[PDB]
Write a protein that binds this ligand. Structure first.
Ligand SMILES: Cc1cc2nc3c(=O)[nH]c(=O)nc-3n(C[C@H](O)[C@H](O)[C@H](O)COP(=O)(O)OP(=O)(O)OC[C@H]3O[C@@H](n4cnc5c(N)ncnc54)[C@H](O)[C@@H]3O)c2cc1C
Ligand SMILES: Cc1cc2nc3c(=O)[nH]c(=O)nc-3n(C[C@H](O)[C@H](O)[C@H](O)COP(=O)(O)OP(=O)(O)OC[C@H]3O[C@@H](n4cnc5c(N)ncnc54)[C@H](O)[C@@H]3O)c2cc1C
Lengths: 474, 474
């Protein structure tokens, strides 16, 4: 009595669970396999994003920001408090409650949509056959007409500082500290390192970020990255570029890190060290030798522009394949794939995928950067508006940053929108929507924007493109 | 000899100052007359919006919210404080600084754009001639080829409770209290009353809102207004509908208000009473008897759909004319008018002017309401998404409210977007931009939205229109 499904999804992350639900919505008998469990051995959907990634980081970022603001920015509004203290265990407990509630909601969506969730390790055998390994080493083989490989990724482990889930930890561990470490070191100045570094810095940690690369957020706009580094150094993140870690020595509750930069070989001791150099795609026991699915030199599963593998009916989405390792990317690929299975001539749009960094000020952008377009030989018009001139921002006592719009000098078509400041993610989305309809700098500048709102910064930025802004001289 | 200008603008509010700057940008020798002065008799640009309206209210709203959150919502994040106290004088002092900074900036924009600002009372004589009355009763006449009347509005004064800038105050006075009134009464449950009522309620006042009308925000969507009333009553605003004020008696530092509702005649005593039933258009000494500009039964200056009066070359914009009394409305009318003067084929679109109520949760919308479209005989498709399911919102500890999208059942064209919750104004602007390009519910549902962000609620709402949402059952 072999079980049979129309679609089998291996993995329950932003790519996997969305796909499963979407397949069920289209009448496909879907099953979603997942090995990840909560702290009591029970199934936990939502992947990295929900369990040890996106949500958790945002929870601690919001709580840690409310503490920093209460200590320094409350006086200005006339608000006094006594001493302001943070109980880390309770901060982390609030986060756990949020995660537990959200994971339970995905399970609710699965039941309501009719998705059969299976708890175990899934492996793709030959002939779209899937082997599920139960907790007690028992094996069951299930039949699938379509398979969606969505195993995501894991953190990179570096030889000089191997993680030991105690003094040296990865992103997952850095979300579990039960006390603020006096001295915190972070390897990797990327999005993850900066968010995790910001949290503990706000709570009193002496944070040092050792980045081996000579650049800082090179993917972002030169102006946005120059501002982020300046603002983040003020917040207590001692960001050191061109610093390569060569070794570490754990001693009791301390670790002495050894690195090399332009000046020579230095040493620094931390109470806790977070390794966050990047993430590698996961395919551990995911494929049988004769499954027919090819892996690439860097660990990613080969797929075409539609996330289809060599094998008919076998697709691979999210972090385990090429592209930006973002949750919304994975999700959209999941939807694109399911529609393709149902026969739609679907293809998602990779050109307008925004990126968001949840530091404070928030950073986000969509489209091309100014420096990438100078190298591409495109003459552009640049308009910017600082939040220092936004009335809404002044009311909120959060005036740092700006909005930058980039248009083509000949057509006036908006080629990119970049923001660093309050509600940056929302302003960038407004830009993305406009660009989707192929907006010009003029088109946005002619629209009616609410007053007073943070959205106006995008409006003044668009007008400033062609030197027609009202709230900043041209 | 006699001074000559291409454009003369009477009034320096959101309609007036924007128009002046915009006229200067297009090479028109512009002059802007303004009688309003700061507390030291010196010119103060920005009108009601900047001096005693928009900006000031937002400042106190943001500060008062930070106090409420610190008292009740901090323990959840693990943050403990001593006693939390608000120094009202400092709260109001921060606001004054913001206003002073912004008013100075408009003056800076005028100088930089080459606008001649004149400090005095302007009056439109016959033949596009403008009479300026200086502080010492001296009179000067200036010549104009075009005149833009932008005298705005003032608060309604009611006979049963005449304002005395002490116990009984209007919006302007309610922004100047130097102590939290123990018992605060508010006449009018409109946008202004709710924002002013919310501020002092959060600071410990016992607030009662007497609304004569049987409805509550009837201009908003039925769902948005039903939710706002529920949430605002929980926050301490005792909103009483069908309660008409018949008289008041001031006695020392108290006022006994007398009203009539369905139950009979009641009495209640307040320490401070804010009159906020609405606003009337201002035309005091604005027109000479033979200027040729017609006034309406309710005080508004007659204009066509392009803000042009009967007199050639005489335009009237903002609150002094028909339409929603909003700053961004006035501004856009100012721009529309200036472009028409320069000969451009300009024409406003009044259907896509969003409205924003800055209470917490924030309320905003653009386009038509569900109830207005049922009466209009338009078959619609409705999609909604609650913030209780937004991961970003849970992280922020602010889950109340929802996003509601309305599309035409045949074309799928988005006819309206309504929001009550976090970043409501920004999500609605995203909708406005989409509608400007004539979006369908499907168009938005197919875009890539960042995760996790509040913008996703607009995304799930758009998908839910045609029953394709992922995070809420269909
Ligand atoms: C601290 C942190 C913060 C982040 N913040 C953001 C953010 O703000 N925004 C953003 O867009 N991205 C963020 N990311 C990245 C985001 O987590 C990933 O892009 C996203 O989770 C990828 O989704 P996925 O479903 O492809 O893989 P995952 O979410 O990793 O899901 C893969 C799942 O597959 C399971 N699995 C793997 N192999 C098997 C098997 N053989 N059998 C059964 N199950 C298997 C795993 O247990 C896992 O649960 C963050 C990451 C981290 C670490
Ligand atoms: C408490 C409060 C909060 C508000 N909040 C908001 C909000 O959040 N968002 C929003 O969109 N709107 C808000 N409004 C409404 C908004 O303030 C007005 O719609 C806005 O000011 C636009 O008005 P205007 O430019 O047409 O004229 P106004 O801004 O009213 O200014 C007109 C100017 O003309 C001057 N004037 C009149 N006659 C003469 C004359 N003869 N000579 C010289 N000068 C003259 C006046 O002194 C005044 O400065 C709020 C109002 C109040 C009271």
């Amino acid at each position: 009595m072999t079980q049979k499904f129309d679609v089998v999804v291996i993995g329950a992350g932003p790519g996997g669970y969305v796909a499963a639900i979407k397949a069920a919505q289209l009448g496909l008998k879907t099953a979603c396999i997942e090995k990840y469990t909560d702290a009591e051995g029970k199934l936990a959907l939502g992947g990295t994003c929900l369990n040890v990634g996106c949500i958790p980081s945002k929870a601690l970022l919001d709580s840690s920001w409310k503490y920093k603001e209460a200590k320094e920015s409350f006086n200005v509004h006339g608000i006094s408090t006594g001493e302001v203290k943070m109980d880390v265990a309770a901060m982390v407990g609030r986060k756990a409650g949020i995660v537990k509630n959200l994971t339970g909601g995905v399970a609710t969506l699965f039941k309501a949509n009719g998705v059969t969730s299976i708890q175990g390790h899934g492996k793709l055998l030959a002939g779209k056959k899937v082997e599920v390994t139960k907790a007690d080493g028992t094996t069951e083989v299930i039949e699938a007409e379509n398979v969606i490989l969505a195993s995501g990724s894991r953190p990179i482990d570096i030889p000089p500082a191997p993680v030991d889930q105690n003094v040296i930890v990865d992103s997952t561990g850095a979300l579990e500290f039960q006390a603020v470490p006096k001295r915190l070191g972070v390897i990797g100045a990327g999005v993850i390192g900066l968010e995790l570094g910001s949290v503990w810095a706000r709570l009193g940690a002496e944070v040092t970020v050792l980045e081996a690369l000579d650049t800082f957020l090179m993917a972002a706009d030169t102006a946005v990255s120059k501002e982020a580094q300046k603002t983040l150094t003020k917040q207590g993140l001692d960001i050191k570029l061109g610093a390569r870690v060569t070794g570490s020595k754990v001693n009791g509750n301390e670790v002495e890190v050894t690195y090399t930069n332009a000046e020579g070989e230095q040493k620094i001791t931390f109470d806790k060290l977070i390794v966050a150099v990047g993430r590698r795609p996961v395919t551990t026991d995911l494929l049988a030798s004769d499954s027919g699915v090819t892996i690439d030199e860097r660990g990613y599963i080969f797929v075409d522009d539609y996330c289809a593998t060599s094998v008919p009916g076998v697709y691979a989405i999210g972090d385990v394949v090429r592209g930006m390792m973002l949750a919304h990317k994975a999700s959209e690929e999941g939807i694109m794939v399911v529609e393709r299975i149902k026969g739609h001539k679907a293809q998602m749009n990779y050109d307008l995928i925004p990126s968001v960094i949840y530091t404070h000020p928030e950073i986000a952008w969509v489209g091309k950067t100014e420096q990438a377009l100078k190298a591409e030989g495109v003459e552009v018009n640049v308009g910017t508006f600082p939040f220092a001139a936004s009335g809404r921002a002044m009311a909120a006592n959060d005036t740092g940053g700006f909005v930058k719009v980039i248009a083509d000098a000949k057509t006036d078509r908006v080629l990119g929108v970049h923001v660093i400041g309050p509600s940056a993610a929302e302003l960038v989305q407004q830009g993305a929507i406009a660009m989707e309809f192929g907006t010009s700098a003029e088109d946005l500048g002619m629209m009616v924007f609410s007053h007073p709102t943070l959205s106006e910064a995008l409006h003044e930025a668009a007008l400033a493109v062609n030197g027609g802004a009202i709230h900043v001289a041209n």
